[PDB]
């Protein structure tokens, strides 16, 4: 499946991500496409900042929804 | 939890929700909620519950919520009205009505919280519509009560009312948008066609419809007994 | 997104609007397109009447959803 990742300047990307997949991952998938090191990477999804050790499904990340990305 | 929202969208139906918040003054989604909503006051109010924005040079505290259709991917912007009154039957009760146990169901704010099926739900509306039986209040709109005739249990959230379907969901604004101008002091256009709603002065018995080109249609009448104006008694 | 306001004569007036615009907007809105100063404008949603200062989330009035218009004299 497909999720969104929109930046702060407004464009918004795409990533193939599995619902097993971790925040680590997602963050990888994200510096590939646009290069932004993890370690300056802040993810929300539903007012809650994103935690490295759980995976997508532990936060009800469905399909082709969106999560904000915000530098450290 | 479950909540429930009516999905005009795709679904055309009552549909469980999610529950989405954005920062209120940048109408983003970027503000970090300092504790969960835990009741519905905090997302239904505004500025019910504070967070931070994490927009970079964005100061925004509160908290705006809104919910989305679950059943489908949806545009975050696209957004659907929650049906606060619906809610999962967790405690199994009987419909008022049909008395069978259905899911989810709408739970009135009588004392008693009776429990109505959404089919039920339906049915009732719909009559109650036909027969011209639903209720204004100046404050809440055209709305109905517990269907048991329970006492102040008019429905607050009027877009409950959705499950009469497009159709006669229409019709119920604009029933209600008659029922208003009554309210309002006002009289209803007796000439066929026409139906302007009109908010004369008080004294004033010679009413004319005349906003202007498709507005009104020009007719002169008698606000007692809905005929052109005379100038004697209505016989 | 777009709003409707219907007269119970059945003109309809098709708006832009945001959900944050306040009521006075869309009143302003409407006599941009017809010449009705907001003054007297009156504005029903669902039965209830519309407040000047408040705005159209507070309504929750969705996407394609429709305004009554009544107009005072
Ligand atoms: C953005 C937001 O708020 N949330 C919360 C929330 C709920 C939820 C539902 C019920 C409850 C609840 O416990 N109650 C109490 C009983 C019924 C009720 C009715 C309305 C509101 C809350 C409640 C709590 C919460 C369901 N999804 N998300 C998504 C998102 C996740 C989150 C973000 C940031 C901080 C904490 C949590
Ligand atoms: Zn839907
Ligand atoms: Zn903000
Ligand atoms: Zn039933
Ligand atoms: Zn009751
Ligand atoms: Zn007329
Ligand atoms: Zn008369």
Redesign the pocket.
Known sequence: MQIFVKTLTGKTITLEVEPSDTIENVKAKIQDKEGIPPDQQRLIF???QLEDGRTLSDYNIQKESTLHLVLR | ?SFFVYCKGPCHKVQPG????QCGTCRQATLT?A??????D??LIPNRMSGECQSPDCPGTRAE?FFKCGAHPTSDKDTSVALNLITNNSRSIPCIACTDVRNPVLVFQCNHRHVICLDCFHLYCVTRLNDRQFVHDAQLGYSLPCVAGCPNSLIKELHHFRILGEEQYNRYQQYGAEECVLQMGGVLCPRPGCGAGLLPEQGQRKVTCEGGNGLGCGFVFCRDCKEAYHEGECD
């Open positions: 539903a007012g809650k | 939890s999610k529950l989405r918040v909620l504790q969960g909503p835990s009741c519905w905090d997302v919520f």
